[PDB]
Design a protein around this ligand. Structure first.
Ligand code: NA
Ligand code: NA
Ligand code: NA
Ligand code: NA
Ligand code: NA
Lengths: 214, 217
């Protein structure tokens, strides 16, 4: 099985800038049978390049493909707002046909620190036998953000889930929800619940905390 | 004009069977190899199976080998994918794709493999308080849980409140049920003056919930 590794995972850029996307194969790709696709949310993928360097019909000149063997590149010479999407490489020379894991080209904007909010479990939620503690990080950029849960100052691991929104269409920021999940009985054994947030926009980590029952 | 129209998708249980079909038009069908490509919700493209123009050669990803069968009826311009012994991990949008370097794709057909039965959500308010007040802004929300299948729609004040609303993607839980949250930031001065209600609609179960989000001290 030919493994295709796409790099970087995310390319943060602005319109007018050049995008360089890489695709590296674990073994040499048979007769440059390499394709590039673009995919927008809620749409099927669209062929951009086939045979490593041939532009598909209807594809703008700004898109160009190159490389051979183990190393391929997709170049977008001058980004247009419609080019912010997910890009995949695929080899079709030998079975199993494989896709790369994708590269997202995201809208670059200025750094914005998150606004941090904490939500203690409601009585209605506790009545269900579960304590969900929610920490909200709102309108931040870049996407990289660290959330640390602390219960009576002990660092938490393996008992939380994170969800992130897609980049906002108007301000290009992200929002993230981190939920600490404990059983009601376990939640009642501890007093101090804290969410510690680390981000480029913050000069030092921001903590939001509460005491159970207050 | 080249057209690929998928059908046969829907809700199915693990261990169950489903047959997807793709009706092709606008080209000599038998002259092209055809593939099935799937995409799990929020994930990347995964190649599933390919078949030559004649149907004499079939190819499968290791993850579907022995369970799925690709076939074609060249006298009917139809591509098929017989999916047996279905697993929760087979949940995805399934695309019909033409050729080698897929120049045409169908719109896709959603397949949801789950042992869960259709169920409406439980709604829990995320009340605003001093703990969710950043400066002169307060955050409030609603946790929407234990529902199946996707989607739920969440609106605030019957659609009158749209500014600063963030509805998070659903997360599949071990129960086979989904959960999400919807939040909104508002002026902290509006609390106790402006009423905030999250309206949760779950069409598959014919259920709708309103939850008035009340400020705390
Ligand atoms: Na490269
Ligand atoms: Na998949
Ligand atoms: Na089969
Ligand atoms: Na066969
Ligand atoms: Na066949």
């Amino acid at each position: 099985e030919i493994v295709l590794t796409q790099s970087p995972g995310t390319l943060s850029l602005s319109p007018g800038e050049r995008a360089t996307l890489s695709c590296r194969a674990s073994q040499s790709v048979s007769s440059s049978y390499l394709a590039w696709y673009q995919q927008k949310p809620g749409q099927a993928p669209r062929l951009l390049i086939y045979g490593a360097s041939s532009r598909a019909t209807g594809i703008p000149d700004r898109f160009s493909g190159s490389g051979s063997g183990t190393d391929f590149t997709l170049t977008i010479s001058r980004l247009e707002p419609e080019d912010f999407a997910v890009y995949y490489c695929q080899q079709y020379g030998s079975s199993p046909l494989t896709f790369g894991q994708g590269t997202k080209v995201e809208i670059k904007r200025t750094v914005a620190a998150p606004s941090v909010f904490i939500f203690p479990p409601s009585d209605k939620k506790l009545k269900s036998g579960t304590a969900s503690v929610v920490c909200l990080l709102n309108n931040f950029y870049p996407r990289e953000a660290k959330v640390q849960w602390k219960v009576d100052n002990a660092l938490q691991s393996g008992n939380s889930q994170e969800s992130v929104t897609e980049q906002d269409s108007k301000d290009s920021t992200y929002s993230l929800s981190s939920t600490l999940t404990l059983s009601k009985a376990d939640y009642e054994k501890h007093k101090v619940y804290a969410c510690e947030v680390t981000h480029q926009g913050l000069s030092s980590p921001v903590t939001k905390s509460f005491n159970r029952g207050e | 004009e080249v057209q690929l129209l998928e059908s046969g998708g829907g809700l199915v249980q693990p261990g169950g069977s489903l047959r997807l079909s793709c009706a092709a038009s606008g080209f000599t069908f038998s002259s092209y190899a055809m593939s099935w490509v799937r995409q799990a919700p929020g994930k990347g493209l995964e190649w599933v199976s390919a078949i030559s123009g004649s149907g004499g050669s079939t190819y499968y990803a290791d993850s579907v080998k022995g369970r799925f069968t690709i076939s074609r009826d060249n006298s009917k311009n139809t591509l098929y994918l017989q999916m047996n012994s279905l697993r929760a991990e087979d949940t995805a949008v399934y695309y019909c794709a033409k050729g080698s370097g897929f120049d045409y794709w169908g719109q896709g057909t959603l397949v949801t493999v789950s042992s869960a039965s259709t169920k409406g959500p439980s709604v829990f308010p995320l009340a605003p308080s001093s703990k969710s007040t950043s400066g002169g802004t307060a955050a409030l929300g609603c946790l929407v849980e234990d529902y199946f299948p996707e989607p739920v729609t969440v609106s605030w004040n019957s659609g009158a409140l749209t500014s600063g609303v963030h509805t998070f993607p659903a997360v599949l839980q071990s129960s086979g049920l989904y959960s999400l949250s919807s939040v909104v930031t508002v002026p902290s001065s509006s609390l106790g003056t402006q009423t905030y209600i999250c309206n949760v609609n779950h069409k598959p179960s014919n259920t709708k919930v309103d939850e008035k989000v009340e400020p705390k001290s």
